[PDB]
Amino acid sequence: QGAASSHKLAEANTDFAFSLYRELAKSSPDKNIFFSPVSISSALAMLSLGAKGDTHTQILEGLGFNSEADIHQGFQHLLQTLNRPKGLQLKTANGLFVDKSLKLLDSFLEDSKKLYQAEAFSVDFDPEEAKKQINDWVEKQTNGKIKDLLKDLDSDTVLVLVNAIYFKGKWKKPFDPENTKEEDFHVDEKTTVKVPMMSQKGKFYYYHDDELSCKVLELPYKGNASMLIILPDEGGLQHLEQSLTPETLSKWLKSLTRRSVELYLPKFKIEGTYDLKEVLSNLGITDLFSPGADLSGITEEKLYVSKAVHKAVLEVNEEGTPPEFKADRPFLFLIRENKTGSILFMGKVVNP
């Protein structure tokens, strides 16, 4: 009863972010992780617009809300904030593609656009020319930074959710290229990888958690966002991930002090592609992706979510505007919006 506060929204999003991280990490060790948890929260909420019955409850309770919670005004306000000119101006894509034989309730069509600024398309689902149209659209929407998103397409497909994002930020305090020297990145005991190491000597907000044997450090982005980098102490990553709760994050933000750091960070590019069906399956959101889904708020005809791809790409370089922090082994990071607190990105860099 009543649109949730902004604070409910920032708490739910963030307990959803970390639980999602925790599941991806469980299901694929030794692999790079990169996703935008705010984008997934948003795409589910958009879908909750058309979800009735218990398809609805699974989504809300998965995202972190009361069954009878009202979340839309809140999300609208938030995206409005992130998608502002003083922000990161994120090159993004969120398409909804339904079989063309389905008369969609054109109120759902209206709402998802004003509230979530994400377009929905009615399309014919022959496997061939339809994957092209979609992949080609994703390409456009991200300015060629996410090419050929979808791999295959089953014949019987009726509803495709696509969610894709590319990010490359400008640093507040830029690295000097003439400090970038090739170095060894110890991926593990038996594996070495030559990476270009950016080095900066300056003042950064910093903290050595030894309650969790690891280092934490903030890098500020141009558009009022910051990267939180978490460097585990020698071979303690496993346990670190276990201790990766919204409560720990807050402990860390309280503990950072602005210090002189000798900072060594690899320039890198990573990516993550995720099938939301198998990932959200553990988070309790299951019906939505299965024959008996209630989406009668999308169309009076039968319908469920046939496939859902989320893909995020991050590129980190030096551009552009004492304790040593040397990330020459696998580390965690996240990128948070300074004004809202919203976790835009979480990530793990194992293979730069």
Author numbering: -4 to 316, 331 to 361
What's written in the study?
With the aim of changing the specificity of conserpin to that of α1-AT, a conserpin/α1-AT chimera was previously produced, where 9 residues within the RCL (P7-P2’) were swapped with the corresponding residues from α1-AT. The resulting chimera, conserpin-AATRCL (379 aa) has a 61% sequence identity with α1-AT (148 residue differences). To understand if there are any structural changes caused by modifying the RCL, we determined the x-ray crystal structure of conserpin-AATRCL in the native state. The overall structure of conserpin-AATRCL is identical to that of conserpin—a structural alignment reveals a root mean square deviation (RMSD) of 0.2 Å across all Cα atoms. Like conserpin and indeed many other serpins, the RCL of conserpin-AATRCL is too flexible to be modelled into the electron density. Importantly, conserpin-AATRCL does not inhibit HNE, the protease target of α1-AT. SDS-PAGE using 1:1 and 2:1 serpin: protease molar ratios reveals a faint complex between conserpin-AATRCL and HNE, but also showed a large amount of cleaved species compared to the complex formation between α1-AT and HNE. In comparison, the formation and stability of a complex may be hindered by the charge−charge repulsion between the electropositive S3–S4 binding pockets of HNE and the electropositive surface of P6−P3 of the RCL. Despite P7-P2’ of conserpin-AATRCL being identical to the corresponding region in α1-AT, the overall flexibility of the RCL region as a whole was not reduced to the level of α1-AT, while the hinge region of the RCL, which inserts into β-sheet A first during insertion, exhibited higher flexibility in conserpin-AATRCL compared to α1-AT.
Inhibitory family members typically fold to a metastable native state that undergoes a major conformational change (termed the stressed [S] to relaxed [R] transition) central for the protease inhibitory mechanism. In previous work, we designed and characterized conserpin, a synthetic serpin that folds reversibly, is functional, thermostable and resistant to polymerization. Conserpin was designed using consensus engineering, using a sequence alignment of 212 serpin sequences and determining the most frequently occurring amino acid residue at each position. The reactive center loop (RCL) protrudes from the main body of the molecule and contains the scissile bond (P1 and P1’ residues), which mediates α1-AT’s inhibitory specificity against the target protease, neutrophil elastase (HNE).
